[PDB]
Amino acid sequence: EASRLGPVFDSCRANNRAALIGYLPTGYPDVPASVAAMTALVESGCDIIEVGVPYSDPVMDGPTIARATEAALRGGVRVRDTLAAVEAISIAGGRAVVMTYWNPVLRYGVDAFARDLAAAGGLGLITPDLIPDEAQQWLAASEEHRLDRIFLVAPSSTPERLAATVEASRGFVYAASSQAAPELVGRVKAVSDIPVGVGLGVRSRAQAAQIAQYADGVIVGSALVTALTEGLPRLRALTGELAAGVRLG
Amino acid sequence: EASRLGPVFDSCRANNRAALIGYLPTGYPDVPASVAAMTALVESGCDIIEVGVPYSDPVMDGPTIARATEAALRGGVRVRDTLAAVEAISIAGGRAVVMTYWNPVLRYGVDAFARDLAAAGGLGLITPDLIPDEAQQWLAASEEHRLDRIFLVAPSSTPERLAATVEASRGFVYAASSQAAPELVGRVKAVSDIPVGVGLGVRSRAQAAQIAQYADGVIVGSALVTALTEGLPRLRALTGELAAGVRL
Amino acid sequence: IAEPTSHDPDSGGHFGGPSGWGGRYVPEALMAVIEEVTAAYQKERVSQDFLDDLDRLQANYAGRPSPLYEATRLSQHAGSARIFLKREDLNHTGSHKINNVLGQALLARRMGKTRVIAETGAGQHGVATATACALLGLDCVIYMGGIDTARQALNVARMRLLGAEVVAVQTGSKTLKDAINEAFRDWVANADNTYYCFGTAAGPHPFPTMVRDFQRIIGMEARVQIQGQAGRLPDAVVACVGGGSNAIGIFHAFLDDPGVRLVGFEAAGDGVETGRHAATFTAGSPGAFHGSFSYLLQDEDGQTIESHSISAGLDYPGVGPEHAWLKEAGRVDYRPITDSEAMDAFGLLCRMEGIIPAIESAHAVAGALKLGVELGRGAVIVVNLSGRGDKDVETAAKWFGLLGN
Amino acid sequence: SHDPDSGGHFGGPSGWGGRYVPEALMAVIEEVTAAYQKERVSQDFLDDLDRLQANYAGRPSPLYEATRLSQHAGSARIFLKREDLNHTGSHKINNVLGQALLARRMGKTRVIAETGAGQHGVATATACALLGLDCVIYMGGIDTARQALNVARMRLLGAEVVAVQTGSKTLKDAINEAFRDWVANADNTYYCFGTAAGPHPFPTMVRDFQRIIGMEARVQIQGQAGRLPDAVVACVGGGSNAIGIFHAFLDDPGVRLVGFEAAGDGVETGRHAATFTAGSPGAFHGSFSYLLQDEDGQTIESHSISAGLDYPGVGPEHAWLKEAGRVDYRPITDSEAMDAFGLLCRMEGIIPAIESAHAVAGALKLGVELGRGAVIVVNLSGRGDKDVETAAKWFGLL
């Protein structure tokens, strides 16, 4: 059976481009403004929106996203506001997945969160601190409620672990990172036809274009947050530049 | 063979009184002023003068004397200044003994110090931190240079140690301290006929009279230094009161 | 000798079944280095030459065994029970943490790693790690929150005298949280030459098991000593619980003694009803935190609640997963002790026995006094005295009005 | 054989030691001496002390071969005897446990003691709390005003602390006030003297309580190294830690014994505490020994970056051993001590007392002298937690 995000990538590869995948955290700079920001990403040409659930103890995150998530939490942001942002994105004709650390999902109830994300129009979950080894409950919830499940791979991932991570993913596999990124994408292609999204601190049209030569999706987050902090117009302009970068034809 | 201070205590007990024994430290507030004060003690009626050698670590002394010896050391007082003080007292017709902690004596040389104290007219040594147990060199030099040796006893002294300390003493024994002084004195009395001097921080005429009732010598130190600090004329006056106290 | 594996987790790090407590709730970016360390430790923990090396440093350098001291002058305050103090306060560096960093620094060297990193709150684990690194000639980098570094000038200075670099983290809240974040990032970038010295019996597998293994010695020694002095096994063995290393270390040797009660004492701060506490078991619930599934203090969304205690070392919103298992299994009871109960016990131990304990350790003493009343006259209670209180003299002096204003 | 005569004299007619004290103190000094003579041969006393040493103080302390120092010591083998690991952080615990037990056997309910920067006072307060004795520590006012945390330790332990404003307002005058208190309170008070000096019986008693260091060290070095050491060394203030480690080796004729004393800015500068190197014989605090004194015999002000080695006297048993040719005493400067402090931190992760760092510095020099493979046992008398701030200023880490 087909992934939820499969048709977006099928459609992108038919237009000789990569999908633009845009991250923003719920509640930055507050809940309404973040929703207006995520809506604007859909209007400016983001194929997929990663809706970030701010978390008190993020391990993976650089300063830009960390300062933003801390601000979001100071503002009183709730996990259910992420579900509201997903509804809004779906209403605007966008395609939304949720990116979250695992404890909020555990606290919610894993089956419950998958049910409520699906009901909100969410298409999947990105799990940066959930590896397949701990993902039994999530895989059952993912199958039950038809959600894509995007695990991460890294340059240091062993052959055995790259294979298991790719085999357990649905929709795309997130290749998080000079020549490290194409080599990693190459290693994924050797064992699977699954779409690979690449994150690489993308800040410009030229960087998006480089990544779009070898990857199925170009993931961007920090630079969107930096843009949003300036204002909504700046975010629109950057997204347009990035959308032109993902197109090769 | 009799003691050097022997005839002073004879003369006192013949005149129906205790000896007035006055202490001052050399160099307080400077050397010349200290000597003039000791000279004024002789002129005001002190029977025996105790010339104090200032020492950096005087454990038996209270704060009045300690602060004065501290001041004297800050002013550069030397052990030789004490020997000059003894000489001036002797020429003025007075009776001087030296009170000193033992290390200055060791540094001088025990025999040499005894020699030079004898040559200055000095009649004895009072040794607040020399017990008979360590006094072998002192006993030899004492006999050789004909100086009296005034050891201290205390309320706490055992009968054995009191007897040994009194036995090793010549001239007088210093009983240093409720009813503790007269009992201490009484215990010396029950084993020897050596004169006894009593220090009880005497401040006044009435206090000195109270002590001359049982003791052969009334020792006064702290009050003399406090009087001197006020002025030489206050010292003379106080010394006159204490001399009138011992004749009662 | 390689000690038995009956209480060990599965190969995934799980206690109590293949999806129970512990595990590895970490990013795939950390898994290469986590697996390298895991394979290294599996080899070395059954190597007699590794255990001889560690034993030799434990004996001659650190001063093991630590003695067991019957604090007879506490008895009247513990219902006439008998309180025996396992004296980790006398170890080199002044706590049980030295046991851990000796093991890990030896392991780092066995792995060919030239550099060790770690993080610290008030400074104890930072000083311990820098100590072991100076010993073994390893380059040492300690990450420490900007707010902690400005407040701990002498611990930073200790670390630097020991040859370590101290990196003051000035981003975010400038606390422990931010230092952990920088340490984990350094590890990933420098994995080829760098070993990460975990501070407690928590984190992803293999750290809860490894740290506990290096602390097992406490309980091993104590079980022999108490039978020596009391003539029998104790009625209870107790310890304070932060992440859980000292507690698990003293408990382990008593696990199969079913007559021995095991009690861990956690920081209740101003009181468990006040929301200013670190009473993970008493007020927290199951969740993933810092690499393991265990108990934590968390709000209705799963966000970490900020904890408070008068002691730095117990001021932790989580707990090691092995403790979670032992709680679920009914084997160990976990109980709250307030700032005030701890400080009263600190003061008492000073006056009665002349031992100035760590404020952390004072939570266990306070606990032990209460358990003494429960169990009554003649009951035999072993208490882990996890550290000395030199570091706490200023806090205690302010508490008891000894510094004026 | 190494003991003094009944009056406290070592070496016959040279007369090291003795009792150069006022008669006012002799009743109580004879009382302690009699009690020490009875208890030193009583099996109950020695058992009680051995039990406290093991279970309470953490004895034996280990002997650690500091292999990372070796390259800095001519490739000699430096073994550190780890008194830094005792309860309270130094060798002083050995002395106070013994004296405190004695005080309780004597029926005394109150213990007094003097302290400089606070180490002996903390140790004494510790033993008194353990044993239920009332404790009063005398400390010079210059010291209390800059050791606020050590005062607080003492108070936490239940001791009273008296700031002394008489004389210099430092160690020697706290000592002076403690002797005055003992006189007035001798019926119920025991004076816990803090080093191997003072009138008999203290040099001998303090030494006997510190002998355990050397007895352990002798056994441990033979065990680890296979032979007696080439040298045993220690820092020397009043002399307690040094005499404790040396004693067990006095009759081993191939074992060199070296005591290192504080040279401050240097012996030729006048700012030192080099009692044997620059002092001379004299009576001080009840003992005929070497003393820093001027030419009338007044006590000279001493200086060291280390407050523990800043005592103008030295114990009479060391004066005897110097005269016999058995022990050599050598100066170590502030600079040498601090370089050794840093090196020990960096090389072994051991933060030594600055006192103890004088010994380590001396061992590094002795290693270069004796050569590769020589075995040097060093008494590491204390931990350096108390000295971190001083060391941090020295190295510009603040």
UniProtKB/Swiss-Prot annotation, chain A:
- What's the catalysed reaction? (1S,2R)-1-C-(indol-3-yl)glycerol 3-phosphate + L-serine = D-glyceraldehyde 3-phosphate + L-tryptophan + H2O
Q: In which pathway does it act?
A: Amino-acid biosynthesis; L-tryptophan biosynthesis; L-tryptophan from chorismate: step 5/5
Q: Known SUPFAM superfamilies for this protein?
A: Ribulose-phoshate binding barrel
Q: What class of enzyme is it?
A: lyase
The reply on keyword Calcium is no
Determine if Amino-acid biosynthesis is one of this entry's keywords: yes
Which GO cellular component term is one of those annotated? cytosol
Endpoints of the signal sequence: none
Q: Cite the EC number.
A: 4.2.1.20
A molecular function (GO) term: tryptophan synthase activity
Gene3D superfamilies noted in UniProt: Aldolase class I
Biological process annotations from GO: L-tryptophan biosynthetic process
Q: How is the subunit organization of this protein annotated in UniProt?
A: Tetramer of two alpha and two beta chains.
Entry-linked HAMAP family: Trp_synth_alpha
The name under which this protein is listed is Tryptophan synthase alpha chain
Q: Which organism is it from?
A: Mycobacterium tuberculosis (strain ATCC 25618 / H37Rv)
Curated annotation (Swiss-Prot), chain D:
| Reaction it catalyzes | (1S,2R)-1-C-(indol-3-yl)glycerol 3-phosphate + L-serine = D-glyceraldehyde 3-phosphate + L-tryptophan + H2O
Q: Does the keyword Ubl conjugation apply?
A: no
This entry carries the following GO cellular component terms, namely: cytoplasm
Q: Which cofactor does it need?
A: pyridoxal 5'-phosphate
Q: Which domain of life is it from?
A: Bacteria
The record's Gene3D superfamilies line, in alphabetical order, gives: 3.40.50.1100
Query: Which CDD domains does UniProt cross-reference here?
Result: Trp-synth_B
Q: Which InterPro entries match?
A: Trp_synth_b_CS (IPR006653), Trp_synth_beta (IPR006654), Trp_synth_beta/beta-like (IPR023026), TrpB-like_PALP (IPR001926), TrpB-like_PALP_sf (IPR036052)
Please provide an example of a Pfam family that matches this protein in its UniProt record.
PALP
Pathway it works in: Amino-acid biosynthesis; L-tryptophan biosynthesis; L-tryptophan from chorismate: step 5/5
Q: Which family does it belong to?
A: Belongs to the TrpB family.
What is this protein's function?
Answer: The beta subunit is responsible for the synthesis of L-tryptophan from indole and L-serine.
What is the name attached to this protein's record? Answer: Tryptophan synthase beta chain
In the UniProt record, the gene name given for this protein reads trpB
